[PDB]
Design an enzyme around this catalytic site. Structure first.
Site, short mmCIF file in Angstrom:
data_model
loop_
_atom_site.label_atom_id
_atom_site.label_comp_id
_atom_site.label_asym_id
_atom_site.label_seq_id
_atom_site.Cartn_x
_atom_site.Cartn_y
_atom_site.Cartn_z
N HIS A 126 21.89 55.86 44.01
CA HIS A 126 23.31 56.18 43.79
C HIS A 126 24.10 55.04 43.15
CE1 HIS A 126 22.67 59.75 46.15
NE2 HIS A 126 22.19 58.97 47.14
N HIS B 178 28.18 46.52 45.70
CA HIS B 178 27.59 47.43 44.72
C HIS B 178 28.66 47.78 43.71
CE1 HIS B 178 29.54 50.01 47.78
NE2 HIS B 178 29.93 50.66 46.66
N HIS C 57 30.37 50.73 40.64
CA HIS C 57 30.58 52.08 40.10
C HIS C 57 30.98 51.97 38.65
CE1 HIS C 57 30.72 53.82 44.20
NE2 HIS C 57 31.26 52.60 44.53
N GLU D 189 36.68 53.65 40.35
CA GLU D 189 37.01 54.66 41.35
C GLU D 189 38.51 54.71 41.55
OE1 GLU D 189 33.98 54.32 44.69
OE2 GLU D 189 33.66 56.17 43.57
N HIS E 136 32.57 46.88 44.71
CA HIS E 136 32.88 46.99 46.14
C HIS E 136 32.06 46.03 46.99
CE1 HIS E 136 34.29 51.38 45.52
NE2 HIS E 136 35.22 50.44 45.14
N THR F 54 33.69 56.10 49.70
CA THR F 54 33.84 56.97 48.54
C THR F 54 32.58 57.76 48.22
OG1 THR F 54 33.23 55.34 46.92
CG2 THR F 54 35.61 55.51 47.52
N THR F 55 31.56 57.64 49.10
CA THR F 55 30.28 58.34 48.94
C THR F 55 30.00 59.01 50.28
OG1 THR F 55 29.14 56.31 49.59
CG2 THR F 55 29.32 56.74 47.27
C1 LIG Z 1 28.97 51.49 53.88
C2 LIG Z 1 27.84 51.98 52.97
C3 LIG Z 1 27.28 53.15 53.77
C4 LIG Z 1 26.81 50.84 53.02
C5 LIG Z 1 28.26 52.42 51.49
C6 LIG Z 1 27.33 52.80 50.47
C7 LIG Z 1 27.68 53.22 49.12
C8 LIG Z 1 26.59 53.57 48.10
C9 LIG Z 1 25.74 52.30 47.97
C10 LIG Z 1 25.68 54.79 48.39
C11 LIG Z 1 27.15 53.71 46.70
C12 LIG Z 1 29.08 53.32 48.73
C13 LIG Z 1 29.95 52.89 49.74
S1 LIG Z 1 31.69 52.82 49.31
N1 LIG Z 1 31.58 53.14 47.53
O1 LIG Z 1 32.16 51.32 49.31
O2 LIG Z 1 32.61 53.64 50.12
C14 LIG Z 1 29.60 52.45 51.03
ZN LIG Z 2 31.54 51.79 46.39
#
Ligand SMILES: CC(C)(C)c1cc(C(C)(C)C)cc(S(N)(=O)=O)c1
Ligand SMILES: [Zn+2]
Ligand SMILES: CC(C)(C)c1cc(C(C)(C)C)cc(S(N)(=O)=O)c1
Ligand SMILES: [Zn+2]
Lengths: 261, 261
Positions: free
Chosen positions: A64, A89, A91, A102, A115, A196-197
């Site tokens: 993702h 990570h 986006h 985002e 993020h 956001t996922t």
């Molecule tokens: C907290 C965690 C469950 C580790 C998480 C994972 C993602 C991805 C890596 C699946 C995009 C995205 C987010 S997000 N985009 O920061 O809400 C958060």
């Molecule tokens: Zn994110």
């Protein structure tokens, strides 16, 4: 399972992940009518962000995004608990439309968004545990605009061709994560929202820095073309592009700003 | 059944209404990068729009918007089939954030938006039958901004107090619906998309006029404050506000414009 395009895309996430249809969802559009200055939003302190160049940190394509695992000795202070880092990570959009942040500002997408996810360690043993509890998570968001080449972001992007496919892992030497943050980090937007996922847990304290950083067109093109959501041996490959959620209704929230103008 | 807020809000529509998670979804952001001039986009003609002031037309509050029922002798000339009117209605924000158009332009919401819904009466007997069929519907969209008082929109708005609650109905004497359209209706955006409410069928030919109309501050506040979503005898009334869908992704597609300049 879930994607950003097609039958399993964002309008369908709530079918499997109820919170994605619940309240307090992120991201949002940051615009004047919902902003309010709050003088108590003092500067965060970034502790342990200067990772040793002689140590190495795991980069993973999880299908993702691309994520870099962060050590728990990295923390943000200034909040009312200490929050410990867990991963960062990105986006982004795609080569023909490099506008995949985002959060938006006054209706405009930036090129991409970083993020840096943290969890309340005062209170919880790991991020997975913290993710579905109140005040579990704090995420820092950096807006990324197309601009100059950025040598600090390149410490990540130089390894993309080693994590092209879902499940693949690579090691990134340590560097100072604070170099990924913009100028004047004391100026930020703060609000209560969600992941956001999927599974879109409404458990995130968001800090979105006011000022963007720049990466070049060639760095964005690498990020937009290097990665696949699918495994190396998948006979229906899917490019990892356009991995941002649309902005969400406010549901009566305000966004608080540490800057008055 | 469905709502614009809370557990039954837009991210959950696709559970009961699968097309809300399918292709061709509206509304969208209209921005320069995806616009393309098309010389085939000649002026529409609005025939039968000058409604007999001797006839009366039912205004309803259906819990989602306020809708005026229109006669089928009212139609659009200039498309390949005749499209006959069925009803008009509006979408708006709220007094704290009075920017509730559905379509956006260069990322910006207008204050409100009027839709005049038509169906292909050459191919189909009524709007309900047409709504899930090929070439079935055509919607005219007018963007609304705050400005000077608009007597023509007041021909609708003056009746809002009589349709305050869900299920209530008022009669409106015939007036010239063309008065609700903006200046230079020859200037418009055109694309194939969907209904913006359940069942979200991807069967709408959209025409969004380039130029907004104006209504006064007081008119806009009346529309935002006059109506509830709930029945009169509901012990927990809900204001009818923010009754618009968030913009949808629209990738590898164009919006055609009848204007270049
Ligand atoms: C907290 C965690 C469950 C580790 C998480 C994972 C993602 C991805 C890596 C699946 C995009 C995205 C987010 S997000 N985009 O920061 O809400 C958060
Ligand atoms: Zn994110
Ligand atoms: C619920 C209400 C807001 C009144 C509505 C109804 C329709 C139908 C009845 C044509 C499907 C169509 C739309 S729309 N926004 O033109 O797709 C909106
Ligand atoms: Zn509508």
């Amino acid at each position: 399972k879930w994607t950003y395009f097609g039958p399993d895309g964002e309008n369908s996430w709530s079918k499997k992940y109820p919170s994605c249809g619940g309240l307090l969802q992120s991201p949002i559009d940051l615009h004047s009518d919902i902003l309010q200055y709050d003088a108590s939003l003092t500067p965060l302190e970034f502790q342990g962000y200067n990772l040793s160049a002689n140590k190495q940190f795991l980069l993973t394509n999880n299908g993702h995004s691309v994520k870099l695992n962060l050590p728990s000795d990295m923390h943000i202070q200034g909040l009312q608990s200490r929050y410990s880092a867990t991963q960062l990570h990105l986006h982004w959009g795609n080569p023909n439309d490099p506008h995949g942040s985002e959060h938006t500002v006054s209706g405009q997408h930036f090129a991409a968004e970083l993020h840096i996810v943290h969890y309340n360690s005062d209170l919880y043993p790991d991020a997975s545990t913290a993710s579905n509890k109140s005040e579990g998570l704090a995420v820092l968001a950096v807006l990324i605009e197309m601009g100059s080449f950025n040598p600090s972001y390149d410490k990540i992007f130089s390894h993309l061709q080693h994590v092209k496919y879902k499940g693949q892992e690579a090691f990134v030497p340590g560097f100072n994560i604070e170099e990924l943050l913009p100028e004047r980090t004391a100026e930020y937007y703060r609000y209560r929202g969600s992941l956001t996922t999927p599974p879109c847990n409404p458990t995130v304290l968001w800090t979105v820095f006011r000022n963007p950083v720049q990466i070049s067109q060639e760095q964005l093109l690498a990020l937009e073309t290097a990665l696949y959501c699918t495994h190396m041996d998948d006979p229906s490959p899917r490019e990892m592009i356009n991995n941002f959620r649309q902005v969400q209704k406010f549901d009566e929230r305000l966004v608080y700003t540490s800057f008055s103008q």
